[PDB]
C-alpha cells in the first residue's frame, strides 16, 4: 500500500545524519562558487531520487561581502589618534577547521562604508521601546553618536533602522551572554554555549517583502532594469558590524554618563551597562572609530526547483521549500532543514518509482540567498507570482529543523490547525518519558496552548523565512515546525550559536541530536504535512479555525483601542463593522463546513477545494499595507517592531501604535477608523468567498 | 432542442422597442427617485422572467447636481459689471415632453462652485496637442484665462485636465456644429442633429479607473470610511459648464487676438474662430463670467444584480452588464442598450422555465451612475474583486445598441476574436441589399480589417463604459457590441444628440431603427457572445489571436521609439527582451492550442478551461501603471490623452509620449527601459501560463 504510513516509514534518521554531514564540511555562502556546487549536487540527486523534472531557477541579485584585502574591524582611538583596542577580525575557527578556507569573517551584510569615530551611546536591544526610553524619558540624544546595541529580542534589521532615526552615525552589534550563554553548561566545542570570541552575522536590510533591493516587483533575469544604488530598497544609511563580548566587555568597560535605567538594561558582563554617552571622566577623550569597507554587489544565486507531478490535479501546487545558503557552515541553519527536505524527496521518490504520484503536483525547492533577504524565494515568486496565486495550495518551510531538543513548535496559519493537530496525534513522540505515547501527547503537555485545555500552542507565523513571499505578499496557506527548546527556563534567544562559525555538524551530532530522533520527527512532521496536503482528496484546511482566531484578534486590538475611551468617544472610532464581519463569517464558515461535510461530484469537489485554496487568498489586499505595498495580507504581517514576530490585524494596530503621540488626534483617529473599514470590508469579504457561489 | 439557435429566435424586436418606449418615458437620473424606481421594477421582472435570485447592490457615493434655485449659466460682461448676455438656463424641451419635470439642465457634473471672470482663450479641441500648439508654438498663455473648447475628439473630462494644467481659471464646453451637425440632414425634432439651442450634459472627472471619489480601493458601503473632498480623486479644481452652438457663436463672435493657426482650428460657425486672448478692440474691456453653483453630494445608488445558476460549473460566471442611469430619457444612452439586456434576459428565462440551464453560471447586471464615472459597476467589482477574479470568465458591456444604422461595431479583447468572427458568420444581416446573407458578411463588407483580407474591423477596448473595472483593473476578457455610422463619410463625433434632452424614443424610433431590427441583431450578438461563454465546454477563447496582436502592438511601440536612434543607441535601448517575449508567446500559444484541440477528462478540460480564463488575468501587474494604480493591465489601458480610446504597451507609450522636451533625457530613456522590462516580463509570465503545468 502507498499510503502515508508507507512514505513516513521510508524516512531514515541515519540518511538525515548522513546528508547533514555531506552538507556542512565546507561554507556555502550565497554567490560563491562553492555553494553553486551543491546547488548542481541536489539537482542531481533529486533527479536520481526519481523527480520528474529539477532544473535550476539562477536570479542575479544584490549581495554584500566585506572586502577580503581592507577588513572590517573597530577601535578605540586616543586624543593622538591612536589606535589602543581593536575588535577581532576572525573567529578563531573550531576544532579541525582552523584550515578551513573561505570562511566569511563576521560583518553585517549590506552596511555601507565609512570610518565614523564619535562616542557611544548604549541602548539595551535598540527597541522602539528602548529609543523611546533614552529620548522621552531620559532626554539622551543619539545624534552624531555611535550607538552599540545587543543583539536579541527584535530583528536586527529593526534595531539599524531604530538607530537611523534616532540619528546614530553607526551601529555596534554584540553577543551579551544574558541573551546568548546559557547558566550551567560550556562554551563549544565543549557545549553548546557561545564563546566570547564568536559572532553572529546577519544582513541588516528593511525590505519589508520586497526581494532583491535593485528590483522589487520584478525578478532580477537576464533583461531586468535596476534601481541605482541611492533608489534600493532596504539598505542602512550608516555603517555597523557585529562583534562578541570579549570585545563588547572592552567597548563597555569604560562607559560613562547616566546609569542604566533599571536592571532590564543591564546583560551578564562585569560592566556597570551605563548608557553614555562616552567615556568615564579618564578615558573621556578617547572615542570609538568604525571601520567597514564591504562592498554591495550583483552577484548570481541558484535556486534548485524539483517537480513532481500530479495524477489528478497537476495544475494544484503543495510546495515544500527551505533555503540552502548559510553564513559559514550551516551546521543548523539551513542545513539541518535541508538533509530533512532532502531525505523527504528521497522518500517521494522511493513511492514514485513503484509507481505511485501524489493527488496534486508538489513542488520541492533548495532556494538560495536567504540570508541576504530572502532574496531566492521571493525573486522565483515574483517571476511565478500569475502561476503560484491561482495554482498555489500551501508551502510548507524547511529550515532549522532543531534550536533545541525539548518539543515540537509549529507557526503556521489557522486553516492548518486541525491537519497539524491530526498528523501529530498519528506520530511516535521521540522525548524521553513519552515512549509508546504521540507526538501529539508530548507537544501538548509540554507546551500547552494558552486558550485551550488539552491542546499544543501553535504560533502565528512571523518572517525572517522564505515563506513570507508565499503567505503574506502572495497569500498563500503557509506552515513551519521545527523541534525547540523550553521556552520556560531557557531566556536566551533562538539558539546560542546561531549564525556563527560554532555552527557545525559536530554541534547538532555531539549536543543536538546525537541519533537524529529529532530530526527524524520534523522530517515526518514536514514531510506528513506536505503528503496530506498534496494527497487528500478534499484540501485539509478548517476554515473554522480562522473564524475562532478572527475573533481572538479582533478582541486584541479592541482592547487596545479601548486604552483611548476619550478620543474614541470624540472622533467616533467604533469596531462594530469588524465584531460583524468576524461573526458573518464564523457562521458561513459554519455552514460551509457542513456543505463540506454533506456534499461522488468531482466538481463540487473542485468547487469546494477552490474554496479552500482561494480563503487564504481572500486576505490579501492589492493596495498592501500603508508604506508596505509587499506584505499585503490584511490578518497577519511582520511587525513593524521586529520582522521575526507577527502581528493580527497589522494595519489597525501600526494606526493605534503609540498614538497618544501624535501631533494632530483628529488625523490619527481617522486612519484607525479607515484601517478598521479596510479589515472589516476584507474579513467579509473572505467570508462571502465560501458561500454559495450561486 | 435548447441550443444558441433556440435563444436567439426567442428574442424579438418588437418586445425590444416595448421595453426601450417603457424606459423612457421620465428621465432616470442617478441618485433619484425615478432611477430607484426603475431598479425596483427591473429587479421585479428579471425575477418574473425566471432568473434565480435577483438583488439590489447599493452603494453611498459622490454626485454632483445643479443648485435648483441657484442656476448655472454664464454672462459676457460690460466695464460697469452689467450682463449683456446670458447663456440659456435649460434646453428647449422637444415637442409633448414641454410639461415634463425633473429634467435636470445642462451642466457638467462634479464642477467646483465659482464665479470666475476673465478673457476667454479659444484652445480647439482641447487636446494636448491642441496646448502644445498654443504655448510652444503661438506664444499663448493660458494662466489666468477662461478658455473655450469645442467637444470632440477626447473625453471631456482630459479637456478640463489639460485646461487646468495650461493655468486656465475656467472652462467653457461647447458643442460645434461642425462635430455635431451631419450636412443635409435636419436638427431635433425632424431628424437627428442637434439644435443650436442643444447641449452635451456629461462628468469632467479624471478618476483613471477608482470609481467613487471618495472610497478608492474599497467597495463605499455603509461603515466606508470617506476621503474628505480635498483629498477625493479626480475632482476638477476649475469650474466648467457646457453650452450649445447659438450661445457659443455670441462668446466666439467678439474675438479678438491671433488668428486660428490653420483650418484644423476652424468649426462651422460664421466667425474666426480667433484664440484670443480675449475680444476685438471695440469689445476689449467686456469679459467673461462663470457662474457655477452645483454640489457634490453623497448619494445612494442601486445596481441590480440578476444570477442564473450554471448547471455544472456555477462557480464560473460570464456577466452581462450594462447601466441604467441616464443624463435625462436616455432613448439611446443607456436605455437601448438596458432594453436589449431585458430582452435576453426574458429569452434566457424562456429556456429556464422548459428546464435548460447555462453550463457556468450567467450574472446579468443593470449599474447605476454610470453617467458619474463607472461608479455603480466600479463599487460592486471593488466589493465582489475576490469572486471575480478566481470566478471571473468574460464580462459583455451593454451601453447604447445604436448610434448609427450602418454596420456593426466591435471592440474586444484578442481572445474574443474568434468567438466573434464565428457568431456573426450564423447571424443573419439586417442591412438592405444583404438579405439572406451573414452579418459577417456585411460588416466585412461595410468595415475590413485594416490588417487582414476577408475579415472585419474589431478594435481594442477603450474606456468611458462599465466595462474598466472589470478588464482593465481585474483582467477579465470583456467585448462590447453596437450599430454604428459609417465612419467614412460621416465626420461627426459619436451621435450628434448624444447626452441631450432631445435624446429620446422618438429619436430611435423615427430616425435610427424604425423596425427595431439593428436593436436585435445587437441582442443576437451580444446575448449570442454570453450564450456561447457560458454554455460551451471549452471555453471560445483563442491564445493564437493574442500572440498576433502582441506582435503587432510590439512593432508599433518599436517604431515610436526609433524615431529616437541617438538616444536608443546612447542609453543603449533594446526592445529585444519583448520581442522575445512576443515569440515566445507565440509558441507557447502555439502549443497550448495543439493540446486543447487533442486533449472524456473533465479535469484536463478545466484545468484548461483555467488556463483560458486565467489568460488575460495573467497581463495584470499588481503594482498599476505609473501614477495609475487601477489600471493593472499591461497591454490596454484608456489613452492619459483621451480616456475613451485604448492604448497599447501604455506604460511604454507614456514613457516615450513627448520624450524630447524631457529635462533629464537619461532619466526618461530610463524609464522607458524599465517598461520595456515590465512588459517584456509580463508578457512572458502570460505565455507560462499557457505551458504545460507541471
Ligand atoms: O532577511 C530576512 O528576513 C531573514 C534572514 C535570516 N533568517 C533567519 O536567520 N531566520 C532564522 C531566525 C532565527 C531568529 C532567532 N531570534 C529571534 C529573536 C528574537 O525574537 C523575535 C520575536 O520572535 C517572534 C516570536 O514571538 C513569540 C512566538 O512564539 C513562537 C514560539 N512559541 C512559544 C511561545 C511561548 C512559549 N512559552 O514561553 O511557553 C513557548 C513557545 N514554544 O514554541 O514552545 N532573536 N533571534 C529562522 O530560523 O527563521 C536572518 O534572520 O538573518
Ligand atoms: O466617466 C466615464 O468614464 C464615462 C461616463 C460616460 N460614458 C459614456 O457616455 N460613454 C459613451 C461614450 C460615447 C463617446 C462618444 N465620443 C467619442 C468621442 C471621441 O472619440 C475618442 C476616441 O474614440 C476611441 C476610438 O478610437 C478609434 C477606434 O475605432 C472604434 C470604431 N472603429 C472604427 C474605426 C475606423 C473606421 N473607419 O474610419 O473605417 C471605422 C470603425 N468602425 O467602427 O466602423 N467623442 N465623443 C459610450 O457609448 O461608451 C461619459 O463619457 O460621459
Ligand atoms: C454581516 O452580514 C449581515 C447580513 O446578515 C449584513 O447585514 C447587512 O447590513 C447592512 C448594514 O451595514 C444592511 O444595510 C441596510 O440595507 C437597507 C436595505 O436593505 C437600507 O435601507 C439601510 O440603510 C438605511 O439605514 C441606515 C442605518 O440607519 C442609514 O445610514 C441609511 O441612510 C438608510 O436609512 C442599510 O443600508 C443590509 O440590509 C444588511 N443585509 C442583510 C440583512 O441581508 C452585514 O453588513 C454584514 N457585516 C459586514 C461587516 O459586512
Ligand atoms: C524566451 O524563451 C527562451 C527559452 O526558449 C528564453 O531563453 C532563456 O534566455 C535566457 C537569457 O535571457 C538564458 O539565460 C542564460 O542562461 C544560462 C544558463 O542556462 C546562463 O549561463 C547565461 O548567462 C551568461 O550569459 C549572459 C549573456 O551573455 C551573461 O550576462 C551572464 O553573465 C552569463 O555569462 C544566461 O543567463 C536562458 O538559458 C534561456 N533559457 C532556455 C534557453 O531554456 C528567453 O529568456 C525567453 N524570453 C523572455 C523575454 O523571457
Ligand atoms: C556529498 O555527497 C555527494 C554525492 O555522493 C558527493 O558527490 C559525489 O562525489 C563523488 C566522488 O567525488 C563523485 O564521483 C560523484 O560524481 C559526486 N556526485 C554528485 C556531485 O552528485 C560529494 O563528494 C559529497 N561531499 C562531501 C563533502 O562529502
Ligand atoms: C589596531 O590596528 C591598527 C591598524 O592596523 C594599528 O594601527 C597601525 O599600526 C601600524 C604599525 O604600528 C602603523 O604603521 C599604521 O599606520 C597604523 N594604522 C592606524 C590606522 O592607526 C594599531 O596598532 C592596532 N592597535 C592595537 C592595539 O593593536
Ligand atoms: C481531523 O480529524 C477529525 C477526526 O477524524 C476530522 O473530523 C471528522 O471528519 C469526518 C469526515 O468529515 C466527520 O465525519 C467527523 O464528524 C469529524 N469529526 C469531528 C469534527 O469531530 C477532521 O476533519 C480532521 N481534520 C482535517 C483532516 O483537516
Ligand atoms: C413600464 O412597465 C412596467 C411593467 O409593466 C409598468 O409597471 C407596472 O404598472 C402597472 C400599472 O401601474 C402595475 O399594476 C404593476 O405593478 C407595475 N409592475 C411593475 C412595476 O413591475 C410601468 O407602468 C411601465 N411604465 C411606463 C412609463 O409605461
Ligand atoms: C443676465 O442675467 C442676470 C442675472 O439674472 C441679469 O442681471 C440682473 O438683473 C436684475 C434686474 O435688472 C438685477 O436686479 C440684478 O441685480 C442683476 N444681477 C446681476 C448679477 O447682474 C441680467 O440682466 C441678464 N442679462 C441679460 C442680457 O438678460
Ligand atoms: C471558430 O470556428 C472554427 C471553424 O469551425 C473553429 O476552428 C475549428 O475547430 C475545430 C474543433 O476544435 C477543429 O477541429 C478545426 O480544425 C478548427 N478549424 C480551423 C481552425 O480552421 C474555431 O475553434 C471556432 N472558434 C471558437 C469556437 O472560438
Ligand atoms: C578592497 O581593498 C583593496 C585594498 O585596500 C582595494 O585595492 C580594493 O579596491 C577593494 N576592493 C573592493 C571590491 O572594493
Ligand atoms: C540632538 O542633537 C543635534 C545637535 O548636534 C540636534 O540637531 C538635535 O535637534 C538634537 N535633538 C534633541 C536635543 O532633541
Ligand atoms: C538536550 O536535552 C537535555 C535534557 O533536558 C538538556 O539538558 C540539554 O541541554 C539539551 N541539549 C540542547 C542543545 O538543548
Ligand atoms: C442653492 O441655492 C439656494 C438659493 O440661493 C441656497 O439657499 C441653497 O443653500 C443652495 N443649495 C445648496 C444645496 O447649496
Ligand atoms: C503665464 O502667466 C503668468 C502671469 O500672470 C505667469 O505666472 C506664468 O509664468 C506665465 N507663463 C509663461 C509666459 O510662459
Ligand atoms: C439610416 O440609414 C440611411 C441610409 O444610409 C441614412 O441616410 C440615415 O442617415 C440613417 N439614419 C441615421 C440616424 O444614421
Ligand atoms: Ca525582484
Ligand atoms: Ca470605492
Ligand atoms: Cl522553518
Ligand atoms: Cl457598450
Ligand atoms: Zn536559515
Ligand atoms: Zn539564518
Ligand atoms: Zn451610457
Ligand atoms: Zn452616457
Known amino acids: 500500500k502507498h499510503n502515508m504510513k508507507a512514505f513516513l516509514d521510508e524516512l531514515k534518521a541515519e540518511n538525515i545524519k548522513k546528508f547533514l554531514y555531506n552538507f556542512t564540511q565546507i561554507p556555502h555562502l550565497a554567490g560563491t562558487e562553492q555553494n553553486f556546487q ?31 584585502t581592507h577588513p572590517n574591524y573597530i577601535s578605540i582611538i586616543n586624543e593622538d589618534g591612536n589606535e589602543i583596542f581593536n575588535t577581532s577580525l ?25 570610518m565614523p569615530e564619535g562616542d557611544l551611546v548604549y541602548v539595551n536591544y535598540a527597541r522602539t521601546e528602548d529609543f523611546f526610553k533614552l529620548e522621552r524619558d531620559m532626554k539622551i540624544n543619539c545624534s552624531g553618536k555611535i550607538v552599540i546595541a545587543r543583539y536579541g529580542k527584535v530583528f536586527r534589521g529593526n534595531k539599524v533602522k531604530n538607530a ?29 554555549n557561545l564563546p566570547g570570541g564568536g559572532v553572529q552575522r546577519g544582513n541588516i536590510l528593511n525590505l519589508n517583502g520586497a526581494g532583491d533591493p ?10 531586468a532594469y535596476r534601481r541605482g544604488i541611492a533608489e534600493a530598497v532596504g539598505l542602512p544609511s550608516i555603517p555597523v558590524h557585529p562583534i562578541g563580548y570579549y570585545d563588547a566587555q572592552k567597548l563597555l568597560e569604560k562607559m560613562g554618563g547616566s546609569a542604566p535605567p533599571d536592571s532590564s538594561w543591564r546583560g551578564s558582563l562585569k560592566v556597570p551597562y551605563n548608557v553614555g554617552p562616552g567615556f568615564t571622566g579618564n578615558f573621556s577623550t578617547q572615542k570609538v572609530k568604525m571601520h567597514i569597507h564591504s562592498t554591495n554587489e550583483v552577484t548570481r544565486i ?60 508538489i513542488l520541492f525547492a533548495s532556494w538560495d540567498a536567504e540570508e541576504f533577504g530572502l532574496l531566492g524565494s521571493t525573486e522565483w515568486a515574483e517571476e511565478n507570482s500569475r502561476l503560484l496565486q491561482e495554482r498555489g495550495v500551501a508551502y510548507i518551510n524547511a529550515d532549522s529543523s532543531i534550536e533545541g531538543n525539548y518539543t515540537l513548535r509549529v507557526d503556521c ?22 515512549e509508546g505515547k504521540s507526538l501529539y501527547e508530548s507537544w501538548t503537555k509540554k507546551s500547552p496552548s494558552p486558550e485551550f485545555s488539552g491542546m499544543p500552542r501553535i ?24 523541534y525547540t527548546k523550553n521556552w520556560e527556563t531557557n531566556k536566551f534567544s533562538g539558539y546560542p550559536l546561531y549564525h556563527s562559525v560554532y555552527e557545525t555538524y559536530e554541534l547538532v551530532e555531539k549536543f543536538y541530536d546525537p541519533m537524529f530522533k529529532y530530526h527524524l520527527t520534523v522530517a515526518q512532521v514536514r514531510g506528513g504535512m506536505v503528503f496530506e496536503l498534496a494527497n487528500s482528496i478534499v484540501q485539509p484546511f478548517d476554515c473554522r479555525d480562522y473564524a475562532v482566531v478572527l475573533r481572538k484578534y479582533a478582541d486584541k486590538i479592541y482592547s487596545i483601542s479601548m486604552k483611548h475611551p476619550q478620543e474614541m468617544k470624540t472622533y467616533s472610532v467604533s469596531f462594530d463593522s469588524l465584531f460583524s464581519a468576524v461573526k458573518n463569517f464564523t457562521e ?20 469546494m477545494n477552490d474554496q479552500l485554496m482561494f480563503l487564504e487568498r481572500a486576505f490579501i489586499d492589492p493596495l498592501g499595507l500603508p508604506d508596505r505595498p509587499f506584505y499585503r495580507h490584511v490578518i497577519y504581517a511582520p511587525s513593524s517592531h521586529n520582522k521575526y514576530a507577527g502581528e493580527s490585524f497589522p494595519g489597525i494596530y501600526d494606526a493605534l501604535f503609540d498614538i497618544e503621540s501624535k501631533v494632530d488626534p483628529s488625523k490619527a483617529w481617522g486612519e484607525v477608523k479607515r484601517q478598521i473599514y479596510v479589515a472589516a470590508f476584507t474579513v467579509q469579504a473572505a467570508a462571502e468567498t465560501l458561500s454559495e457561489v450561486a
Do not use: C
Request: aromatic share 12%; no cysteine.
Open 38 to 68: 551543491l546547488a548542481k549536487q541536489i539537482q542531481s540527486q533529486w533527479k536520481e531520487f526519481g523527480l520528474d523534472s529539477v532544473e535550476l531557477a539562477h536570479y542575479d541579485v544584490l549581495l554584500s561581502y566585506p572586502n577580503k
Open 90 to 114: 576572525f573567529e578563531p575557527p573550531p576544532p579541525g577547521y582552523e584550515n578551513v578556507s573561505d570562511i566569511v569573517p563576521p560583518f553585517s551584510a549590506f552596511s555601507p562604508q565609512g
Open 164 to 192: 537611523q532615526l534616532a540619528g546614530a552615525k553607526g551601529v555596534i552589534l554584540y553577543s551579551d551572554p544574558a541573551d546568548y550563554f546559557a547558566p550551567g553548561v560550556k562554551s563549544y566545542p565543549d557545549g553548546w
Open 214 to 223: 535593485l528590483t522589487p516587483g520584478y525578478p532580477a533575469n537576464e533583461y
Open 302 to 361: 541558484y535556486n534548485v526547483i524539483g517537480t513532481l507531478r500530479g495524477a489528478v490535479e497537476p495544475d494544484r501546487y503543495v510546495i515544500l521549500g527551505g533555503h540552502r545558503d548559510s553564513w559559514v557552515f550551516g551546521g543548523i541553519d539551513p542545513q539541518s532543514g535541508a538533509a530533512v527536505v532532502h531525505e523527504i524527496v528521497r522518500s517521494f521518490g522511493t513511492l514514485k518509482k513503484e509507481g505511485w504520484r501524489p493527488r496534486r503536483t
Open 413 to 434: 496559519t489557522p486553516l492548518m490547525y486541525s491537519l497539524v493537530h491530526n498528523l501529530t496525534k498519528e506520530l511516535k513522540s521521540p522525548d524521553e518519558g513519552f
Open 459 to 482: 504560533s502565528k507565523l512571523g518572517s525572517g523565512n522564505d515563506f513570507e513571499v508565499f503567505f503574506q505578499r502572495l497569500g498563500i496557506a503557509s506552515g513551519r515546525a521545527r
Open 588 to 607: 458561513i464558515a459554519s455552514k460551509f463546513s457542513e456543505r463540506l461535510q454533506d456534499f461522488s461530484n468531482p466538481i463540487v469537489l473542485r468547487m
